[PDB]
Amino acid sequence: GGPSVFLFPPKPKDTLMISRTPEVTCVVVDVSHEDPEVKFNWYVDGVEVHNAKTKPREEQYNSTYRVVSVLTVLHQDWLNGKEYKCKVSNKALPAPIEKTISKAKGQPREPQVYTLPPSRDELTKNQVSLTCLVKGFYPSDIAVEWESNGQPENNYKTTPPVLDSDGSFFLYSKLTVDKSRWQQGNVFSCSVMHEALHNHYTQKSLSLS
């Protein structure tokens, strides 16, 4: 067989907010119980770097092993196309495995946010859904969140980026609330974080006139 490798990109919100810390993660699965020594080699646009933080291996219930190296990156570097290569070297492997990832190439496109109130037919229920349509953005890397009264509402579920017919993406975010909170006229806001948004952020409120 052979241990396997998967390279994971940073979280959209991590690359956009200067507060957060974006990291590219390198995972190694099917790591042999007898030859568990795993060595990582990280490279940015060719040049090797050494500030990756490798975590202690861990036997997986299927009696194998799993090792993970986390490379912290620069929001700019990721946003600027820089390429991140992870090179895994192990015994049970003829030659070190290599995986490379970078941000999607292509003209970014500022997203448009629209807040839709619940359908009338839904007011018969005890909870109603507030929708936040986010369309025409690119690349698909994006982060949607809801809040009210400054506080974050967490009972929401965003769909994953869907490719539209014009080559851009669009998704929808459904926040679920108590009819009571809604009809009471409270104000909710859908915030979107994207690279093509001024200051990588925007908001749209939603309530009952």
Ligand X SMILES: *[C@@H]1O[C@H](CO[C@H]2O[C@@H](C)[C@@H](O)[C@@H](O)[C@@H]2O)[C@@H](O[C@@H]2O[C@H](CO)[C@@H](O[C@@H]3O[C@H](CO[C@H]4O[C@H](CO)[C@@H](O)[C@H](O)[C@@H]4O)[C@@H](O)[C@H](O[C@H]4O[C@H](CO)[C@@H](O)[C@H](O)[C@@H]4O)[C@@H]3O)[C@H](O)[C@H]2NC(C)=O)[C@H](O)[C@H]1NC(C)=O
Ligand Y SMILES: *[C@@H]1O[C@H](CO[C@H]2O[C@@H](C)[C@@H](O)[C@@H](O)[C@@H]2O)[C@@H](O[C@@H]2O[C@H](CO)[C@@H](O[C@@H]3O[C@H](CO[C@@H]4O[C@H](CO)[C@@H](O)[C@H](O)[C@@H]4O)[C@@H](O)[C@H](O[C@H]4O[C@H](CO)[C@@H](O)[C@H](O)[C@@H]4O)[C@@H]3O)[C@H](O)[C@H]2NC(C)=O)[C@H](O)[C@H]1NC(C)=O
Separation CA 97–CA 95 (nearest Å)? 6
Task: Name which of residues 18 to 57 contact ligand Y (CB under 6 A).
Answer: 27, 29-30
Separation CA 164–CA 162 (nearest Å)? 6
- Indicate which single residue of 32, 41, 64, 89 sits in contact with ligand Y (rule: CB under 6 A): 64
Separation CA 36–CA 57 (nearest Å)? 8
> In this structure, are residues 146 and 132 in contact, taking their beta carbons and an 8 Å threshold?
yes
Structure tokens at 186: 């409270």
> In this structure, are residues 193 and 143 in contact, taking their beta carbons and an 8 Å threshold?
yes
- Which residue's CB is nearer to a copy of itself, number 62 or number 209? 209
DSSP bridge partners of 7: 26
> In this structure, are residues 179 and 126 in contact, taking their beta carbons and an 8 Å threshold?
yes
Q: Indicate which of a copy of itself, ligand Y, other proteins, none lies near residue 86 (CB less than 5 to 8 Å, by partner kind).
A: none
Q: Does 98 bind ligand X (CB under 6 A)?
A: no
Of 41-49, 129-137, 144-152, 195-203, the window that binds a copy of itself (rule: CB under 8 A) is 129-137
Structure tokens at 79: 């946003």
DSSP bridge partners of 172: 133
Chain residues that interact with ligand Y, rule: CB under 6 A: 4, 6, 8, 27, 29-30, 60-62, 64, 66
Q: What residue ranges bind ligand X (CB under 6 A)?
A: 6, 27, 29-30, 60-62, 64, 66
Q: State the residues that interact with other proteins by CB under 8 A.
A: 17-19, 74-76, 79, 198-201
By CB under 8 A, name the binding residues for a copy of itself.
Answer: 112, 114-119, 121-122, 125, 129, 131, 133, 135, 155, 157-160, 162-165, 170-172, 174, 176, 204
